[PDB]
Design an enzyme around this catalytic site. Structure first.
Site, PDB file in Angstrom:
ATOM      1  N   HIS A  77       0.838  -1.238   0.000  1.00 26.52           N
ATOM      2  CA  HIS A  77       0.000   0.000   0.000  1.00 26.52           C
ATOM      3  C   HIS A  77       0.846   1.249   0.000  1.00 26.52           C
ATOM      4  CE1 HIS A  77      -2.507  -2.976   2.367  1.00 26.52           C
ATOM      5  NE2 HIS A  77      -3.191  -2.767   1.260  1.00 26.52           N
ATOM      6  N   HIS A 117       5.545   7.066   6.347  1.00 28.46           N
ATOM      7  CA  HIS A 117       5.274   6.627   5.020  1.00 28.46           C
ATOM      8  C   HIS A 117       4.740   7.773   4.224  1.00 28.46           C
ATOM      9  CE1 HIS A 117       1.455   6.408   7.178  1.00 28.46           C
ATOM     10  NE2 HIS A 117       0.994   6.856   6.023  1.00 28.46           N
ATOM     11  N   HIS A 150       2.067   9.069   0.713  1.00 33.20           N
ATOM     12  CA  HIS A 150       1.067   8.849  -0.274  1.00 33.20           C
ATOM     13  C   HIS A 150       1.420   9.706  -1.488  1.00 33.20           C
ATOM     14  CE1 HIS A 150      -1.566   7.086   2.835  1.00 33.20           C
ATOM     15  NE2 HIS A 150      -0.939   7.936   3.586  1.00 33.20           N
ATOM     16  N   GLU A 180      -3.257  13.552   0.470  1.00 30.17           N
ATOM     17  CA  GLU A 180      -4.524  13.172   1.107  1.00 30.17           C
ATOM     18  C   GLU A 180      -5.274  14.399   1.588  1.00 30.17           C
ATOM     19  OE1 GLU A 180      -3.635   9.727   3.724  1.00 30.17           O
ATOM     20  OE2 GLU A 180      -4.397   8.630   1.943  1.00 30.17           O
ATOM     21  N   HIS A 186       3.523  11.137   6.165  1.00 35.06           N
ATOM     22  CA  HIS A 186       2.912  10.933   7.431  1.00 35.06           C
ATOM     23  C   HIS A 186       3.874  10.324   8.392  1.00 35.06           C
ATOM     24  CE1 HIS A 186      -1.273  10.742   5.407  1.00 35.06           C
ATOM     25  NE2 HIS A 186      -0.843  11.987   5.623  1.00 35.06           N
ATOM     26  N   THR A 202      -5.952   6.960   7.694  1.00 35.84           N
ATOM     27  CA  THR A 202      -6.435   7.112   6.317  1.00 35.84           C
ATOM     28  C   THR A 202      -6.414   5.852   5.526  1.00 35.84           C
ATOM     29  OG1 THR A 202      -4.394   7.833   5.293  1.00 35.84           O
ATOM     30  CG2 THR A 202      -5.795   9.560   6.275  1.00 35.84           C
ATOM     31  N   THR A 203      -5.973   4.740   6.142  1.00 40.08           N
ATOM     32  CA  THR A 203      -6.092   3.423   5.548  1.00 40.08           C
ATOM     33  C   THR A 203      -6.874   2.576   6.505  1.00 40.08           C
ATOM     34  OG1 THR A 203      -3.964   2.885   6.558  1.00 40.08           O
ATOM     35  CG2 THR A 203      -3.992   3.463   4.271  1.00 40.08           C
TER      36      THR A 203
HETATM   37  O1  MNP Z   1      -1.368  -0.546   8.371  1.00 38.78           O
HETATM   38  C1  MNP Z   1      -2.311   0.314   8.177  1.00 38.78           C
HETATM   39  O2  MNP Z   1      -2.570   0.716   7.048  1.00 38.78           O
HETATM   40  C2  MNP Z   1      -3.110   0.955   9.300  1.00 38.78           C
HETATM   41  C3  MNP Z   1      -2.283   2.110   9.785  1.00 38.78           C
HETATM   42  C4  MNP Z   1      -1.151   1.999  10.625  1.00 38.78           C
HETATM   43  C5  MNP Z   1      -0.442   3.042  11.037  1.00 38.78           C
HETATM   44  C6  MNP Z   1      -0.734   4.315  10.563  1.00 38.78           C
HETATM   45  C7  MNP Z   1      -1.810   4.533   9.735  1.00 38.78           C
HETATM   46  N1  MNP Z   1      -2.242   5.819   9.345  1.00 38.78           N
HETATM   47  O3  MNP Z   1      -3.296   6.062   8.749  1.00 38.78           O
HETATM   48  O4  MNP Z   1      -1.412   6.813   9.485  1.00 38.78           O
HETATM   49  C8  MNP Z   1      -2.562   3.399   9.365  1.00 38.78           C
HETATM   50 ZN    ZN Z   2      -0.684   7.936   5.571  1.00 37.86          ZN
END
Ligand code: MNP
Ligand code: ZN
EC number: 4.2.1.1
Length: 257
Positions: A61, A91, A93, A103, A116, A195-196
Site C-alpha cells: 500500500h 510513510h 502517499h 490526502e 505521514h 487514512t487506511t
Molecule cells: O497498516 C495500516 O494501514 C493501518 C495504519 C497503521 C499506522 C498508521 C496509519 N495511518 O493512517 O497513518 C494506518
Molecule cells: Zn498515511
C-alpha cells in the site's frame, strides 16, 4: 482485500470498515479561510535527535520507514497535544502525476505527495492499544511539491529498488527523519482518523503549512514501486491516497496568524 483500484479502492472501504462513513474521518480539505487561529495552541515540539530507524518495508500500500519505539527516543509533544507521542513509522502517499497525491488538500489544492510521521501516545503503552483511543495517535503530515531535490530523502529513494514488490523489506538503519522537515512548524490541527483501513478514529492530525520540495526524479522513483508481490502482474504503486472526507462537526485550528 482493500486497495486503491476501481474494484477495491476508497469508495469500497466502507463495506469492510463501516467507520469509513464515520464522524471523524481523514483526510479533509483544509479551508484556510475558515480555519481559526488559536492562540492557545503551542509550538510543536519535534524531538528526533535520537530516532533509530531500523528497516523499510513495502507493505503493498506504501512503504514504511520503521523505528525502534521501545524507548522515548523520537517524540512529538506540544502543539495541540497533551503528553508524549513516540515515533513508530513514516510513510508517504503519492500520485501518478504531480497534480495529485496528497490526502489532505489546502483550499482544494492537491500536492504531489504527503508524508505521514506516525506517533503513538505513550500513556497507552503500545501502538495496538493506542489505536483504540480517541487520543491514541498523533500524525504529522507534511506536503511534498516537485521542484528542488530534498537531499534528506535521497537515502530513502535509493533503497526502493530493493523493496519493489509487496512484502519486501530491507535494513534501513541510521536514517534521520529531521531531513524531511520544512523550515516552519506552523500547522493546522483537527481530530480525525487513520487514512487506511481500519480507519480508526484515533488521530490528532497536525498538518504542516509549509511543503517540502522534492525533485521529479525522486518522486518518479516512488512511482516505480509495485502494489503487487514478486512475480505477479505489474501494477505500479501510484495514487495510493484517500480523497478528502466530510468535515462534519469539526473545527480545523491554525497555530499561526
Ligand atoms: O497498516 C495500516 O494501514 C493501518 C495504519 C497503521 C499506522 C498508521 C496509519 N495511518 O493512517 O497513518 C494506518
Ligand atoms: Zn498515511
Amino acid at each position: 482485500h482493500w486497495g486503491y483500484g476501481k474494484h477495491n479502492g476508497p469508495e469500497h472501504w466502507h463495506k469492510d470498515f463501516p467507520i469509513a462513513k464515520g464522524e471523524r474521518q481523514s483526510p479533509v480539505d483544509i479551508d484556510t479561510h475558515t480555519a481559526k487561529y488559536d492562540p492557545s495552541l503551542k509550538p510543536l515540539s519535534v524531538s528526533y535527535d535520537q530516532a533509530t530507524s531500523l528497516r523499510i518495508l513495502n507493505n503493498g500500500h506504501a512503504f514504511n520507514v520503521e523505528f525502534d519505539d521501545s524507548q522515548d527516543k523520537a517524540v512529538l509533544k506540544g502543539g495541540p497535544l497533551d503528553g508524549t507521542y513516540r515515533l513508530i513509522q513514516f510513510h508517504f502517499h503519492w500520485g501518478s502525476l504531480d497534480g495529485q497525491g496528497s490526502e489532505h488538500t489546502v483550499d482544494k489544492k492537491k500536492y504531489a505527495a504527503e508524508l505521514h510521521l506516525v506517533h503513538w501516545n505513550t500513556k497507552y503503552g503500545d501502538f495496538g492499544k493506542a489505536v483504540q483511543q480517541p487520543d491514541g495517535l498523533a500524525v504529522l503530515g507534511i506536503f511534498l511539491k516537485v521542484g528542488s531535490a530534498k537531499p534528506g530523502l535521497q537515502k530513502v529513494v535509493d533503497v526502493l529498488d530493493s523493496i519493489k514488490t509487496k512484502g519486501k523489506s530491507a535494513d534501513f538503519t541510521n536514517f534521520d527523519p529531521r531531513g524531511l522537515l520544512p523550515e516552519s512548524l506552523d500547522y493546522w490541527t483537527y481530530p480525525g482518523s487513520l487514512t487506511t483501513p481500519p480507519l480508526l478514529e484515533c488521530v490528532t492530525w497536525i498538518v504542516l503549512k509549509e511543503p517540502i520540495s522534492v525533485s521529479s526524479e525522486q518522486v518518479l522513483k516512488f512511482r516505480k514501486l509495485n502494489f503487487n508481490g514478486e512475480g505477479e502482474p505489474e501494477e505500479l504503486m501510484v495514487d495510493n491516497w484517500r480523497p478528502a472526507q466530510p468535515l462534519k462537526n469539526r473545527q480545523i485550528k491554525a497555530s499561526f496568524k
